Symmetry: C3
């Protein structure tokens, strides 16, 4: 209700978004937008959440994020050897040692995160990027040059290996973000985009690139999945052949299904050695 009234401000401002700019927005609307982003930043709110077993996307939070662009000017940011120019502030810009100590994760230079993304305890941010509206749950490792795009929901004990990208979804408002459920491993150079949902304890190896159009071939059943990686799927890069046999095109291949559970990297590597 306090929350209902916050949402009210957002839904009202967004309907008139066309005429909102940094120099005309009233103080109530600004503070409200900023409060939402603050709640997203602390994980008190989140853009999508799993309710009664289904992923629900809260449109009004995406409105809030969009409005946060519209109401803030780009500003110069001092970078020591370089300068920047952007309108989304840095999550940690203000964090002090006490706050870092209390929240219990690690941010490894030059890893950065935009204000408005939630990073949970026992996470390790290797040099990587986490965009606004994202949620990175406890125990998760984000490896070097990995990216957690806007609004993505990364569960607990997830491993985003080096250079793995999880695609942002801000617009359309109605579209769910990309979702990597608890215990998932995503191997080096892989990309999961466009609101694909990787169910819990899946194991995606290197260089597996999955958007909504990507064929996920279940070699056991012969079925082609789109848009969703079944829980416990072990998935690797492959191709499907043309009717000809004269060429073949990329796909992901489900090559084993395992029980969905927290796994070490050593464990993952050993499971990937266990495939035909």
């Amino acid at each position: 209700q306090s929350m209902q009234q916050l949402q009210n401000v957002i839904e009202t401002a967004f309907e008139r978004r066309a005429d909102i700019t940094p120099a005309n927005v009233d103080t109530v609307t600004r503070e409200a937008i900023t409060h939402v982003i603050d709640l997203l930043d602390t994980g008190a709110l989140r853009v999508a959440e799993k309710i009664d077993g289904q992923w629900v996307t809260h449109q009004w939070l995406k409105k809030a994020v969009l409005l946060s662009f519209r109401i803030n000017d780009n500003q110069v940011m001092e970078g020591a050897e370089t300068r920047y120019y952007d309108k989304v502030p840095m999550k940690f810009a203000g964090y002090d040692e006490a706050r870092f100590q209390r929240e219990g994760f690690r941010v490894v230079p030059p890893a950065t995160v935009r204000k408005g993304a939630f990073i949970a305890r026992n996470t390790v941010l290797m040099p990587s990027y986490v965009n606004i509206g994202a949620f990175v749950d406890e125990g998760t490792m984000v490896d070097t040059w990995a990216t957690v795009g806007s609004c993505a929901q990364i569960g607990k004990n997830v491993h985003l290996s080096g250079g793995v990208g999880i695609g942002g979804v801000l617009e359309p408002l109605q579209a769910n973000p990309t979702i990597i459920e608890d215990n998932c491993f995503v191997g080096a150079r892989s990309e999961v985009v466009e609101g694909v949902i990787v169910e819990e304890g899946s194991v995606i190896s290197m260089g597996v690139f999955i958007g909504q159009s990507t064929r996920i071939y279940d070699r056991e059943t012969g079925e082609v999945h789109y848009g969703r990686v079944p829980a416990g799927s072990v998935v690797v890069s492959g191709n499907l052949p043309s009717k000809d046999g004269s060429y073949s095109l990329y796909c992901a291949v489900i090559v084993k299904k395992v029980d969905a559970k927290t796994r070490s990297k050593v464990g993952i590597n050993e499971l990937l050695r266990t495939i035909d």
Copy 2:
């Protein structure tokens, strides 16, 4: 005469480059080199350009860039939590807020650019790197951990997705740089290099790796192209089989062709859904 005088200084210098050092360079030559880098930085000059439907490379600008290296010593660059040591200054180190504001683009930390690359209005540099001599035109998105290599020419309204690399080209002086023409989409994790030209309105998916080494198979005609993606090509990764079918080898496949133009990512999404 001014530009003729400049080019002549550079080419004359470059002829005797073996005898030019940071310690021994006269100020006229130093000034001429640094002024050419400034012209490339502001987009007043550009390493290659399209004249009469034809891409022309200007060797002398490549010679300028190469001499900019030769005449400058490495120097310690303070970076807050770390220090660097290099001889190419940083484009934005001297940018004030007014300059950023009039030039109309955004630089999202930790994105950086070397001095001597042009960045046009309405582009957004997510964390990324733009090397010396490159040209990134209006309304382009350079997404997280992407790279625009030396001398690369990126067109207007291009989307370089996360992890995309556009390969640098200095030597040979004669070689056209890597060119991405207007309205191109390039999917996450892709690399285009070695003066490959991606013609306008093309859509390259994820995980596409194209150099002069790469077969570009038109599955509609069965023809292999090298070094060029024809305008409006929709390109995905695939493989072509050995004569006996024992193995197959990576290639890029043109799966269909569209009529090149201004885009939305409703239509990028939807173009790839019709893929076979």
Copy 3:
């Protein structure tokens, strides 16, 4: 001997590491750990090395590196526009011009390196990351968004193209690091992980992904290698088909063997 004594202090500490925290770590233990990391940082010690022509892995160095995390607290690190919070010091934080001049490599912003990795002379780090216990030898290029993981050994006159990741191997503790031998070219977007050894003078094309499970198919002999790219191999991405041909899965393919100019080597695909 002093080195034997150092190794014993490290191994004894490793043995009772479950008892050791930043809070209770004693100065003898700390000094020995920190001293090993200093030696790794200067290249005086290295995690694996080629002895009598084979690679030898010094597990106790891996134990020191592992312990260096356990015994240190995270600290806030001021970063201009942002702040960090981590427990491994930055290699260059206190370098001055004279030291850069002496060690003779370049560090292109925003390239960074953790303390406890050795960079040799005439190497160029484009924006990249070199993790603790790595050794990057002379005349090597580490191009933009490359990554040299924990303990990885990169040889002389190696080209790690843009977006090339060399996997860390702290654990398992027993494993050798990922190794790129001398004179190798690694094409952009490639990733070589899990202790794979890429032998000298190999040419790996773009977008090649090799871990310990990756079939490296020799199209000439029909061999399938695991874990090792043979010296002077030219390597590209490919697939190996299923029995019935319904689908195919990723591999590497050795498409020629050359003694010891790249684009001509690669522009031959059949």
